[PDB]
């Protein structure tokens, strides 16, 4: 499903992402905007043969198993297809493991190049208090 901006902001807040590891909710909505355009079904294959899955484009080389990435580590212990669900719970629980791994949100190349250091507050403007 393609979330709307305020709609995604509210679901992420319910899942405890606002200020998870000190990253405010605007950061997570901006990451999802530029990673998938708010679309839970987005997939993209990488140069090395791994694929990125879902709203936060989580990669099969380390985080989920998709049956076709040699050396996939599957650290969130999920099939990658679970990350394409209209329910974002598995994507959020895996993203909390990724962001806690020491490199923060720099793990999402679109967050580093398009969101980091911008006014990310503009992304949750209008979301219900």
UniProtKB/Swiss-Prot annotation:
Matching Gene3D superfamilies: 1.10.530.10
GO biological process, one term: killing of cells of another organism
Catalytic activity: Hydrolysis of (1->4)-beta-linkages between N-acetylmuramic acid and N-acetyl-D-glucosamine residues in a peptidoglycan and between N-acetyl-D-glucosamine residues in chitodextrins
UniProt tissue specificity: In the egg white and polymorphonuclear leukocytes.
Keywords: Allergen, Antimicrobial, Bacteriolytic enzyme, Disulfide bond, Glycosidase, Hydrolase, Secreted, Signal
UniProt domain C-type lysozyme: residue ranges: 1-129
Binding site for substrate: 101
Disulfide bonds: 6-127, 30-115, 64-80, 76-94
Note: Lysozyme C is capable of both hydrolysis and transglycosylation; it also shows a slight esterase activity. It acts rapidly on both peptide-substituted and unsubstituted peptidoglycan, and slowly on chitin oligosaccharides.
Entry similarity comment: Belongs to the glycosyl hydrolase 22 family.
Functional summary from the UniProt entry: Lysozymes have primarily a bacteriolytic function; those in tissues and body fluids are associated with the monocyte-macrophage system and enhance the activity of immunoagents. Has bacteriolytic activity against M.luteus.
Name of the protein in question: Lysozyme C
């Amino acid at each position: 499903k393609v979330f709307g901006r305020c709609e995604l902001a509210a679901a992420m807040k319910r899942h405890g992402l606002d200020n998870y590891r000190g990253y405010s909710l605007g950061n997570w909505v901006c990451a999802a905007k530029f990673e998938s355009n708010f679309n839970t079904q987005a997939t993209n294959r990488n140069t090395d043969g791994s694929t990125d899955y879902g709203i936060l484009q989580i990669n099969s080389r380390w985080w989920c198993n998709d049956g076709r990435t040699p050396g996939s580590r599957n650290l969130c212990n999920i099939p990658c297809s679970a990350l394409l669900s209209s329910d974002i719970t598995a994507s959020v629980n895996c993203a909390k493991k990724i962001v806690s791994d020491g490199n923060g949100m720099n793990a999402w190349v679109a967050w580093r190049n398009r969101c980091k250091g911008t006014d990310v507050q503009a992304w949750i403007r209008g979301c219900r208090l």
